[PDB]
Design an enzyme around this catalytic site. Structure first.
Site, PDB file in Angstrom:
ATOM      1  N   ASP A  63       0.824  -1.203   0.000  1.00 19.08           N
ATOM      2  CA  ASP A  63       0.000   0.000   0.000  1.00 19.08           C
ATOM      3  C   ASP A  63       0.860   1.254   0.000  1.00 19.08           C
ATOM      4  O   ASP A  63       1.848   1.341   0.730  1.00 19.08           O
ATOM      5  CB  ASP A  63      -0.917   0.021   1.218  1.00 19.08           C
ATOM      6  CG  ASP A  63      -2.123  -0.862   1.054  1.00 19.08           C
ATOM      7  OD1 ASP A  63      -3.121  -0.638   1.770  1.00 19.08           O
ATOM      8  OD2 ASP A  63      -2.072  -1.783   0.215  1.00 19.08           O
ATOM      9  N   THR A  96      -4.022   4.981  -3.699  1.00 18.25           N
ATOM     10  CA  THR A  96      -3.152   5.786  -2.855  1.00 18.25           C
ATOM     11  C   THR A  96      -1.767   6.001  -3.446  1.00 18.25           C
ATOM     12  O   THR A  96      -1.073   6.933  -3.028  1.00 18.25           O
ATOM     13  CB  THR A  96      -3.010   5.136  -1.477  1.00 18.25           C
ATOM     14  OG1 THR A  96      -2.575   3.782  -1.631  1.00 18.25           O
ATOM     15  CG2 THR A  96      -4.336   5.143  -0.749  1.00 18.25           C
ATOM     16  N   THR A  97      -1.341   5.166  -4.391  1.00 16.56           N
ATOM     17  CA  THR A  97      -0.016   5.298  -4.985  1.00 16.56           C
ATOM     18  C   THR A  97      -0.030   5.933  -6.366  1.00 16.56           C
ATOM     19  O   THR A  97       0.999   6.455  -6.799  1.00 16.56           O
ATOM     20  CB  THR A  97       0.672   3.933  -5.074  1.00 16.56           C
ATOM     21  OG1 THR A  97       1.909   4.067  -5.781  1.00 16.56           O
ATOM     22  CG2 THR A  97      -0.200   2.947  -5.800  1.00 16.56           C
ATOM     23  N   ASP A 394      -9.112  -2.933   1.412  1.00 20.45           N
ATOM     24  CA  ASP A 394      -9.175  -2.260   0.116  1.00 20.45           C
ATOM     25  C   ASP A 394     -10.392  -2.717  -0.683  1.00 20.45           C
ATOM     26  O   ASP A 394     -11.119  -1.896  -1.262  1.00 20.45           O
ATOM     27  CB  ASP A 394      -7.895  -2.522  -0.677  1.00 20.45           C
ATOM     28  CG  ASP A 394      -6.765  -1.594  -0.289  1.00 20.45           C
ATOM     29  OD1 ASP A 394      -6.996  -0.664   0.512  1.00 20.45           O
ATOM     30  OD2 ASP A 394      -5.640  -1.794  -0.790  1.00 20.45           O
TER      31      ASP A 394
HETATM   32  N1  LIG Z   1      -5.075  -6.777 -15.225  1.00 24.93           N
HETATM   33  C1  LIG Z   1      -4.578  -5.526 -15.343  1.00 24.93           C
HETATM   34  N2  LIG Z   1      -4.071  -5.093 -16.514  1.00 24.93           N
HETATM   35  C2  LIG Z   1      -3.572  -3.853 -16.652  1.00 24.93           C
HETATM   36  N3  LIG Z   1      -3.534  -2.953 -15.656  1.00 24.93           N
HETATM   37  C3  LIG Z   1      -4.011  -3.252 -14.426  1.00 24.93           C
HETATM   38  C4  LIG Z   1      -4.572  -4.588 -14.197  1.00 24.93           C
HETATM   39  N4  LIG Z   1      -4.963  -4.621 -12.911  1.00 24.93           N
HETATM   40  C5  LIG Z   1      -4.678  -3.412 -12.364  1.00 24.93           C
HETATM   41  N5  LIG Z   1      -4.109  -2.598 -13.268  1.00 24.93           N
HETATM   42  C6  LIG Z   1      -3.661  -1.205 -13.033  1.00 24.93           C
HETATM   43  O1  LIG Z   1      -2.998  -1.075 -11.776  1.00 24.93           O
HETATM   44  C7  LIG Z   1      -3.232   0.229 -11.242  1.00 24.93           C
HETATM   45  C8  LIG Z   1      -3.471   0.149  -9.741  1.00 24.93           C
HETATM   46  O2  LIG Z   1      -2.236  -0.019  -9.053  1.00 24.93           O
HETATM   47  P1  LIG Z   1      -2.183  -0.703  -7.600  1.00 24.93           P
HETATM   48  O3  LIG Z   1      -0.806  -1.291  -7.454  1.00 24.93           O
HETATM   49  O4  LIG Z   1      -3.407  -1.565  -7.432  1.00 24.93           O
HETATM   50  O5  LIG Z   1      -2.261   0.508  -6.546  1.00 24.93           O
HETATM   51  P2  LIG Z   1      -3.401   1.638  -6.572  1.00 24.93           P
HETATM   52  O6  LIG Z   1      -4.667   0.870  -6.845  1.00 24.93           O
HETATM   53  O7  LIG Z   1      -3.321   2.214  -5.183  1.00 24.93           O
HETATM   54  O8  LIG Z   1      -2.981   2.585  -7.664  1.00 24.93           O
HETATM   55  C9  LIG Z   1      -4.455   0.778 -11.953  1.00 24.93           C
HETATM   56  O9  LIG Z   1      -4.101   1.983 -12.631  1.00 24.93           O
HETATM   57  C10 LIG Z   1      -4.844  -0.267 -12.972  1.00 24.93           C
HETATM   58  O10 LIG Z   1      -5.058   0.349 -14.240  1.00 24.93           O
END
Ligand SMILES: Nc1ncnc2c1ncn2[C@@H]1O[C@H](COP(=O)(O)OP(=O)(O)O)[C@@H](O)[C@H]1O
Ligand SMILES: Nc1ncnc2c1ncn2[C@@H]1O[C@H](COP(=O)(O)OP(=O)(O)O)[C@@H](O)[C@H]1O
Ligand SMILES: [Mg+2]
Ligand SMILES: [Mg+2]
Lengths: 528, 521, 44
Positions: A63, A96-97, A394
């Site tokens: 996170d 959050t990131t 989350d």
């Molecule tokens: N299967 C996937 N394919 C492409 N992008 C993804 C996929 N799952 C999540 N994402 C991307 O990951 C990002 C989220 O990053 P994450 O590490 O979950 O932290 P946060 O949700 O706090 O930003 C989102 O912008 C989303 O577009």
């Protein structure tokens, strides 16, 4: 008149100062550093951080909010970034990131404009106008989902997308379904509000991560008060009490004068009469199991055992109210006020015993329609338990957001690419020296696809350019970065879904924080 | 020499050099806050010994956080505080004005001129300037019921133009005007509550015509009672409702177990007597400054009621004013005239917190703000910005005269004083001329902060004012000069009058000091 | 290392290469500490 050194400010010889662009530049550097720490923790292919506490404890996390919370920083801009992340955590719960990366990219992009002779107020105004354009465009490409108990499939897909980035992804279908079921069981639909005090999340080490389950009842860290009581009941009628199993005692100062032998004998009879009276009052109402917030006595314990009526001791207040809500009973403060209509009903009450240790736990299950729900987490490490708790939180927050507003967009960088295209197209019509700020906003809005591509092991610039060309050629805003290498760039069939309020909040909050940072030109701080 | 007059370590300075040093120090003080003026003004960050930081654009705050110890420089802090106390806006113009007054007459002091002539010239010039300001200010006798709100909105918009919330000023100004149209005839500042909740955008701030306050600490059973009502009656109390000793002085002596049981039952009977007296009045929401027990909580939950304890005193007074009841220290007479009445009560989730809302009262003399931001200093600066607009609106309601901003009135006064100076002979002429030339530090600072060429703009303004253009000032966006009375840059005349009086008083006080003595320790 | 200091005095940070080196060294050391006590002919 020899203006020799004269004192104006207390401790003038030790305090420092920074004025002008240099100060501004310093801020930017700090911000960039912070962002470059978080960039590698983005997407399904991101890695994690290990923080060692001030006392030696170890935490492995992903996170952004927790990462920035456990860091001890000195620079003020770092603290501002930490607080931005915390606020985004407070309202939405996910994303959050991304916001800190976006803010760092925005500050980085403002540097070349500052070097070309632009007033930072102009840059802030251009950023604000670009943010308004992007937010206006964002809800034009959004689709609704539908929120109803019968279907539950879009919600499961959303929770799957949220959990795909965590270490819990080895079993994330199960945990996604658990989260959606819990939220749908607790949520209030007329007022469109949920309450997290009615969801109890707790874990115990041991077993396997796949043993995590959902209990539509209660589970407490207590056991029966006598070692020879039965370990299970199957038609439990619960009597919930707040008074201890002792003879009464007034609160104000009191003295009972004993002046004879007859007085002694009368008091002696009165004690045991009180004990028998309270036991009989409990038994008469038809109850089958008793629960108390305070302790018992030896006489009370043996009288409860002898009358075939188990009991539990020293349970806390929140547990009392959760049991009352789950079983449909009522909390009574006296034995005299106990009636047959104030008992709760529970289909099963059991005492579960874990492995070679001496611990025990009490589970209350098979209740009627219940507004209280518990998540029971297992695992082979303490760090695993903590990270599972954070990931479940989350998912619950995301489902709550879907309850509040029911329209979504598609991730993978498709939304950011479309917003950048809209911002650039609008900026091409602005000739009043503000086109530079809008183009800077559009360029800094494209660091999320590049970060995803770099983390996934592809080449950023070529992939982003190809997807942009495809989006311009075709007419779908649902083309993103193929992070998991499934062949297709379409995120509508890959089922990558995000909430709209999350995106809107990310954009607006990052823009306002950047505007606040750009306004500062001076800083005074004592030396060390 | 054997025995000395004063204690060892006494430091004394006298003559022209000490006066010149004082004038020099005032320049540093004015430079500290010089670049925070105008629509293109920055802001400063100050860190204290403990490590907490504060970011501000308000001049009085910045001067307060600086640990000034120079006796001549403390006067500029004092006048800024006084200006903040009286009118609430204009705490940087006065400082620059005072410093310019000192700096323009420094060379005459160097030549050996008696300071009392300087003081007389300053007093005459200040009197003339204040009279001119009172003469040329624009007012409307019977304006309107709608042209009396637009003026306040313009004043607030001008007051917010240099703050962190400038881009949303049109959104905020409206709100603050409403806030001051409900505040009775005394306009107490304690009748407006400011609440700051982390997380959210600046456009999500709201104003409630009613009252709202945070959730308090609650015992078991609070989650089993309703959280929405439509026509509730509110009982406001100052009574502790829990099982406790009647009095600390009490003492019970008893001889029989039957009387022991009776004494035990007495306390429960007393508590239940209070609870039934509360219940039978028809109230649905109860509030108290004193704690509420768990027994009372469960009793109220069992009868579909809502309770809160340890409510802050200011919030309870605000609720009294909004809903219209009275605080009761006793429950022996809860009539219908001592209960409140609202139209909706709710408990809502706001960004991680729970807030209680009483809304729908048309007889309310109270409003409450909810501010949404992203970090602690962000909402603190938002509140500091709103305070200036609140004070400006209050001052504008009573006296309603308006003068144009941007530097128009400064240049008009400068032209008037220069035209007056040519009439009188002697050193009074030179001193009035210096006073007249010191008044154009405001437009120069506006242009310098914006990033223009100040000389050309000042020459054009001087030519425009000498000919004829009474209300001509600087147009920041078009980088030129323009009429600031048709561009709607308005401000009350009290700001300028008070600023001139305070700056002149500070300059006169600083000039008239001959020597300085410091005692040990 | 960036010239600007983000951390307090005494705070520490290790990045990819050093992080992996430290983790692997620690894990392997712990494993080899207790390798010797495995099987029917281990020692105490
Ligand atoms: N299967 C996937 N394919 C492409 N992008 C993804 C996929 N799952 C999540 N994402 C991307 O990951 C990002 C989220 O990053 P994450 O590490 O979950 O932290 P946060 O949700 O706090 O930003 C989102 O912008 C989303 O577009
Ligand atoms: N739209 C505008 N155009 C030009 N000048 C303006 C405008 N709005 C405000 N000003 C000027 O800004 C100056 C005050 O800036 P500010 O930081 O508020 O100082 P103070 O707090 O001392 O009033 C005033 O002299 C006013 O004339
Ligand atoms: Mg996430
Ligand atoms: Mg001002």
């Amino acid at each position: 008149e020899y203006g020799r050194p004269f004192l104006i400010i207390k401790d003038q010889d030790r305090k420092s100062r920074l004025m002008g662009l240099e100060a501004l530049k310093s801020h930017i550097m700090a911000a960039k550093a912070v962002a470059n720490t978080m960039r590698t923790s983005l997407g399904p292919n991101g890695l994690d951080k290990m923080m060692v506490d001030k006392d030696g404890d170890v935490t492995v996390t992903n996170d952004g909010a927790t990462i920035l919370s456990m860091m001890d920083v000195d620079h003020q801009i770092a603290k501002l970034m930490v607080e931005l992340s915390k606020s985004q955590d407070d309202e939405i719960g996910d994303g959050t990131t991304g916001v800190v990366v976006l803010a760092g990219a925005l500050l980085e992009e403002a540097e070349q404009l500052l070097d070309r002779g632009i007033h930072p107020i102009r840059i802030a105004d251009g950023y604000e106008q670009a943010a308004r354009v992007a937010i206006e465009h964002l809800d034009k490409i959004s689709d609704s989902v539908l929120v109803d108990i019968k279907d539950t499939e879009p919600l499961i897909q959303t929770a799957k997308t949220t959990l795909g980035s965590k270490v819990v992804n080895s079993c994330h279908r199960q945990m996604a379904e658990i989260a959606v079921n819990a939220v749908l069981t607790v949520a209030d639909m007329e007022r469109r509000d949920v309450d997290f005090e009615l969801i109890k999340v707790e874990g115990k080490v041991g077993g396997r991560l796949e043993d995590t389950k959902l209990i539509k009842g209660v589970i407490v860290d207590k056991d029966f008060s006598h070692p020879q009581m039965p370990k299970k009941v199957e038609d439990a009628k619960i009597a919930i009490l707040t008074c201890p199993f002792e003879p009464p005692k007034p609160k104000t100062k009191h003295k009972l004068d004993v002046t004879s032998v007859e007085d002694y004998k009368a008091l002696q009879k009165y004690e045991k009469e009180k004990f028998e009276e309270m036991i009989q009052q409990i038994k008469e109402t038809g109850a089958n199991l008793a629960i108390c917030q305070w302790g018992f006595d030896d006489e009370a314990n043996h009288l409860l055992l002898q009358n075939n009526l188990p009991a539990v001791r020293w349970v806390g207040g929140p547990e009392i109210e959760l049991i009352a809500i789950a079983t449909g009973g009522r909390i009574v403060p006296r034995f005299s006020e106990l009636t047959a209509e104030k008992l709760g009903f529970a289909g099963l009450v059991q005492e579960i015993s874990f492995g070679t240790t001496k611990d025990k736990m009490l589970v209350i299950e098979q209740c009627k329609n219940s507004r209280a729900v518990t998540i029971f987490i297992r695992g082979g490490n303490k760090m695993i338990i903590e990270e599972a708790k954070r990931s479940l939180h989350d998912a619950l927050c995301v489902i709550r957001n879907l309850i509040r507003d029911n329209r979504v967009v598609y991730g993978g960088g498709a939304a950011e690419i479309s917003c950048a295209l809209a911002v650039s197209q609008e900026a091409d019509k602005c000739p009043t020296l503000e086109q530079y700020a809008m183009r800077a906003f559009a360029d800094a809005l494209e660091v999320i696809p590049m970060a995803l591509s770099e983390n996934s092991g592809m080449n950023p610039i070529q992939t982003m350019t190809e997807v942009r060309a495809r989006q311009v050629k075709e007419m779908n805003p649902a083309l993103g970065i193929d992070c998991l290498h499934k062949g297709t760039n379409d995120m509508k069939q890959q089922h990558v879904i995000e909430t709209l309020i999350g995106k809107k909040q990310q954009i607006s909050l990052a823009t306002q924080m950047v505007r606040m940072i750009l306004k500062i030109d001076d800083i005074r701080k004592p030396g060390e | 020499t054997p025995v000395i007059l004063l204690k060892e370590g006494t430091d004394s300075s006298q003559g022209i050099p000490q006066l010149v040093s004082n004038i020099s120090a005032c320049q540093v003080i004015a430079e500290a806050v010089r670049t925070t003026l105008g629509p293109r003004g920055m802001d400063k960050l100050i860190v204290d010994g403990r490590g907490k930081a504060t970011i501000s654009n308000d001049g009085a705050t910045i001067l307060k956080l600086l640990d000034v110890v120079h006796p001549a420089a403390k006067t500029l802090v004092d006048i800024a505080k006084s200006q903040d106390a009286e009118v609430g806006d204009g705490t940087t113009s006065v400082t620059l004005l005072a410093a310019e007054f000192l700096k323009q007459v420094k060379p005459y002091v160097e030549e050996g001129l008696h300071p009392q002539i300087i003081i007389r010239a300053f007093r005459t010039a200040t009197q003339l300037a204040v009279n001119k300001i009172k003469e040329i200010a624009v007012t409307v006798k019977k304006a309107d019921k709608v042209e009396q709100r637009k003026l306040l909105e313009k004043c607030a918009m001008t007051a917010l133009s240099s703050k962190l919330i400038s881009q949303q000023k049109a959104f905020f100004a409206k709100m603050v005007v409403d806030a001051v149209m409900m505040l009775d005839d005394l306009l107490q500042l304690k009748m407006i509550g400011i609440k700051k909740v982390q997380g959210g955008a600046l456009e999500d701030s709201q104003l409630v015509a009613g009252v709202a306050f945070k959730k308090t600490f609650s015992y078991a059973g609070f989650e089993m009672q309703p959280k929405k009502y439509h026509n509730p009656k509110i009982a406001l109390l100052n009574v502790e409702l829990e099982l406790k000793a009647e009095k600390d002085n009490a003492e019970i002596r008893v001889h029989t177990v039957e009387d022991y049981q009776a004494i035990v039952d007495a306390e429960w009977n007393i508590l239940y007597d209070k609870l039934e007296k509360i219940h039978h009045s028809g109230a649905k929401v109860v509030l108290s400054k004193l704690p509420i027990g768990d027994v009372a909580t469960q009793y109220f939950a069992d009868r579909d009621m809502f309770c809160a304890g340890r409510v802050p005193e200011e919030d309870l007074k605000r609720t009294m004013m909004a809903c219209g009841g009275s605080i009761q220290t006793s429950v022996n007479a809860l009539s219908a005239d001592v209960l409140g009445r609202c139209q909706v009560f709710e408990e809502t989730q706001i960004g991680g917190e729970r807030y209680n809302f009483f809304t729908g009262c048309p007889k309310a003399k109270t409003c409450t703000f909810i501010l949404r931001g992203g970090a602690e200093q962000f909402m603190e600066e938002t509140e500091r910005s709103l305070h200036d607009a609140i004070m400006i609106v209050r001052r504008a309601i009573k006296n309603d005269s308006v003068v144009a901003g941007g530097g128009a009135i400064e240049m008009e006064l400068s032209k008037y004083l220069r035209d007056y100076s040519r009439t009188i002979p002697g050193k009074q002429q030179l001193l009035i001329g210096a006073y007249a030339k010191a008044l154009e530090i405001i437009p120069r600072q506006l242009c310098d902060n914006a990033g223009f060429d100040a000389t050309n703009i000042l020459n054009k303004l001087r030519a425009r004012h000498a000919q004829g253009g009474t209300w001509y000032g600087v147009d920041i966006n078009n980088e030129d000069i323009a009429d600031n009375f048709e561009a709607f840059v308005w401000e009350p005349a009290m700001v300028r009058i008070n600023a001139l009086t305070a700056a002149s008083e500070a300059a006169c006080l600083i000039v008239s000091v001959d020597e300085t003595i410091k005692n040990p320790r | 290392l960036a010239p600007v200091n983000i951390f307090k005095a005494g705070a520490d940070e290790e990045r990819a290469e050093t992080a992996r080196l430290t983790s692997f060294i620690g894990a392997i050391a712990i494993g080899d500490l207790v390798k010797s006590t495995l099987g029917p002919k281990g020692m105490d």
